[PDB]
């Protein structure tokens, strides 16, 4: 019952920013850690008012970590590394990754050596970067091989379909998703344009990344809500692995939070499992649900949760191997985020997230055949053969989803 959070990259670090901005007052503390329901799973005991979130903000070209420290973290565990991230996965893996992995894993095993008992890791990053992609992949590699009995969860922002912020980001995405496969037993994928449209629906003016990462932060908070807010029908990360991962390598999740508030519970539950409310733009029409976890929290009523079966027997489409009334991991938590009397999270193992994967595949299917940006990898130590086999693994995973329909 302890969480070590890993934050690599600018996107992952802003996700972490918003994540603790809401997690601190979700337990009644300010952003700086001052006191204004076992909340010690995320936080280490340092001072009676300062409950320190032990999360490593390791990131090449730090830049943003300065504005992170301006909300107080543990300054010893985090590092503002010498810059030079670029958007190269190999540059975060073996060029400058090899000169930071010893220090970051010394920090990590010092953080977990003082742990009474650990459940796993929740890493927030973006697969499309160069720091959060390559450094995250290296951390996954040397963290699975160090603690094979622990359960790494990755909250990765997949690059947007409509427009791109990096010109080599599908290379990075695929060659980090391969490491997420080979090194983690759980993954929640985030898509940016879905977050933009959700925040457009939620608010009345134009949002930005801070609102998107607030939504992502609500997602991550409700992921572990049943673990740190013990009510009835508790949920654990081991339970997430057991009942959301039907096959050994199929552990990529799409997440929706509701509402977007003294709302009527049927509306909250039917809008929680809404095809347009999920935070990753995945394939719903042709896709089906493998394993949906409904984690409701706050002013939730057990009969209300269990009687909202209209949205499951009407809107939710399941695979052939799951029972019609099954496919639900139900969870109750006594505490919901503020502004919500009762709120809900849908964590779905779904076929349509493979569509997410395949769009990166599509980009890789046009770049590798044209020798597009591969010299940036070859001169950095990552050859074309390992990129090809990483894409082969990712395509096999997407085909596993397509076969699991």
């Amino acid at each position: 019952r302890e969480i070590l959070s890993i934050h690599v990259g600018q996107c992952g670090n802003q996700i972490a920013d918003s994540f603790w901005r809401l997690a601190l007052r979700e337990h009644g503390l300010t952003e700086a850690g001052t006191l204004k329901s076992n909340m010690e799973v995320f936080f280490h005991k340092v001072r009676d008012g300062k409950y320190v979130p032990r999360a490593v903000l390791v990131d090449l070209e730090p830049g943003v970590i300065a504005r992170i420290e301006g909300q107080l973290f543990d300054e010893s565990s985090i590092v503002r590394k010498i810059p030079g991230a670029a958007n190269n996965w190999a540059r975060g893996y073996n060029v400058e990754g090899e000169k930071v992995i010893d220090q970051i894993m010394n920090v990590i095993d010092s953080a977990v050596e003082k742990t009474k008992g650990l459940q796993g890791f929740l890493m927030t990053h973006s697969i499309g970067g160069g720091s959060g992609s390559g450094l995250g992949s290296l951390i996954l590699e040397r963290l699975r091989q160090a603690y094979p009995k622990k359960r790494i969860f990755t909250f990765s922002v997949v690059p947007s379909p409509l427009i791109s912020d990096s010109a080599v980001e599908p290379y990075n995405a695929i060659l980090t998703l391969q490491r997420i496969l080979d090194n983690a037993d759980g993954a929640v994928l985030l898509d940016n344009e879905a977050l933009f449209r959700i925040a457009k629906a939620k608010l009345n003016r134009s949002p930005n990344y801070m609102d998107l990462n607030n939504i992502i932060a609500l997602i991550v908070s409700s992921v572990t809500a049943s673990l740190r807010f013990p009510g009835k029908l508790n949920t654990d990360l081991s339970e997430f692995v057991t009942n959301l991962v039907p096959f050994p390598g199929n552990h990529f999740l799409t997440a929706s939070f509701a509402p977007m508030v003294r709302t009527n519970f049927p509306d909250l539950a039917r809008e929680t499992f809404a095809q347009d409310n999920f935070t990753a733009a995945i394939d719903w029409q042709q896709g089906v649900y493998l394993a949906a976890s409904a984690l409701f929290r706050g002013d939730v009523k057990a009969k209300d949760v269990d009687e909202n079966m209209a949205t499951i027997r009407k809107s939710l489409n399941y695979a052939s191997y799951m029972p019609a009334s099954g496919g639900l991991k139900l969870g109750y938590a006594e505490t919901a985020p503020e502004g919500f009397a009762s709120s809900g999270l849908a964590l779905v193992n779904h076929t349509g997230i493979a569509a997410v994967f395949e769009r990166l595949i599509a980009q890789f299917d046009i770049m590798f055949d044209n020798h597009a940006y591969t010299h940036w990898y070859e001169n950095a130590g990552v050859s074309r053969d390992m990129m090809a086999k990483a894409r082969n693994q990712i395509a096999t995973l997407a085909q596993s989803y397509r076969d699991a329909s």
Partner: protein
């Protein structure tokens, strides 16, 4: 600390563009350019250490100026004061005079050790250099010759360091030196061999961009270098500003995003808005004449474009959707589907509260060089002006190799 970048300026156009560039960058930071000292009570705006140094102290630019004639260095000192370190400024007497070989084999060899000693001094004060911006005009003599020698010596000594060149091409409206084709091709060979990137300007495009689209009946060269300076400020703001919404882009980051192939490293630049100090602004960034090179890139083929917005961002989903819609009617390489790096900077420029800079890789730029090569077809079909090239130290077969390398570049693009 942030990844560093030194801007070495060679030749007259390079030195004057450097003067204007550090002027506008300093006044973006809130630093007086004519003095080099920070404004009291005001902190530097953004990551100063990328392009500057607190020399004890003063926020001095990390700029090296070499020119084989005293006039340009003296004029830059007059227009800039104590902004640049005099140790960074190296001058000779006779000049190169449109002769590449003086800067390559001649006074260039004599001036090389002092320039490289100063460059080693500056890089030893760098935390992590991730780019060297060579501000020069390859049409000129000193610029071409010592830019070639300097980038060759960098790649001989260093080579982990990205090199972004910012070269001013000869104008197709008029030539300023008749040996501009010689100098341009001779420096272009070493740019393809040694420089990891090259940014291309052209005076005629900036003239038509600042004549009717700046409401000046006839701009000076100061407006030319000011437009180039707005371009460079927008480009380096990614290397210069960091924060939450803004994404930090190193020059190696901008290189890895903008240079797909090792020989495909020549970039066009454009600026918006084209108004004296949104969708119409989106298209203003992407007009056929908005690029800072006398050519039409919209019949070309954008390899990859760094679109760097800077300013207040009140339409982030709307502007992302506008960029996505604009991408549909632009010529993009199929083999780079992710050909957009949408860089954001919260802080705008000083001239505008809302600006964007296009920094694109386009095949069109090659045909630009092709016309210079066409001009090279005039000076060597009859063996003209090449007596001093041969006498200064170079050889005819070497020059044929250089021209073949330029043709190899142009054929590598297309």
């Amino acid at each position: 600390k942030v990844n560093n970048t030194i801007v070495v300026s060679i030749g007259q156009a390079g030195n004057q563009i450097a003067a204007s560039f550090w002027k506008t960058v300093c006044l973006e930071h809130g630093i007086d350019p004519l003095t080099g000292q920070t404004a009291p009570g005001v902190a530097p705006r953004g990551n100063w250490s990328s392009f500057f140094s607190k020399l004890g102290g003063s926020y001095v630019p990390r700029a090296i100026m070499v020119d084989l004639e005293p006039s340009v260095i003296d004029n830059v000192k007059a227009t800039s004061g104590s902004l640049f370190n005099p140790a960074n400024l190296i001058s000779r007497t006779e000049g190169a005079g449109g002769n590449f070989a003086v800067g390559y084999l001649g006074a260039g060899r004599e001036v090389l050790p002092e320039v490289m000693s100063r460059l080693d001094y500056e890089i030893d004060k760098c935390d992590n250099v991730g780019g060297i911006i060579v501000l020069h005009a390859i049409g000129g003599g000193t610029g071409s010759g010592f830019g070639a020698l300097l980038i060759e010596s960098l790649k001989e000594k260093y080579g982990e360091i990205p090199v972004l060149s910012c070269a001013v091409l000869p104008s197709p409206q008029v030539s300023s030196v008749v040996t501009e084709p010689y100098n341009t091709v001779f420096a272009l060979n070493t740019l393809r061999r040694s420089a990891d990137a090259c940014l291309i300007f052209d005076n005629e495009a900036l003239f038509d961009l600042a004549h009717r689209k700046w409401n000046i009946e006839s701009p000076t060269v100061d407006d030319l270098n000011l437009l180039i300076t707005e371009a460079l400020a927008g480009i380096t703001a990614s290397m210069r500003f960091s924060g939450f919404l803004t994404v930090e882009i190193s020059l190696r980051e901008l290189l890895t995003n903008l240079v797909p192939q090792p020989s495909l490293h020549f970039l066009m630049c454009a600026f918006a808005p084209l108004t004296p100090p949104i969708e119409e602004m989106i298209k203003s960034l992407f007009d056929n004449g908005s690029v800072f090179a006398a050519c039409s890139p919209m019949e070309g083929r954008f390899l990859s474009t760094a679109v760097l917005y800077r300013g207040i961002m009140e339409d982030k989903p709307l502007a992302d959707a506008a960029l996505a819609a604009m991408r549909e009617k632009l010529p993009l390489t199929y083999w780079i589907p992710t050909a957009f790096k949408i860089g954001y900077v919260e802080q705008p420029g000083i001239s505008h509260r809302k600006s964007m800079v296009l920094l694109a890789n386009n095949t069109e730029i090659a045909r630009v060089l092709d016309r210079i090569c066409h001009n090279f077809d005039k000076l060597w079909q009859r063996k003209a002006f090449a007596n001093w090239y041969l006498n200064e130290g170079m050889s005819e077969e070497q020059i044929n190799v250089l021209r073949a390398s330029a043709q190899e570049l142009v054929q590598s693009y297309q």
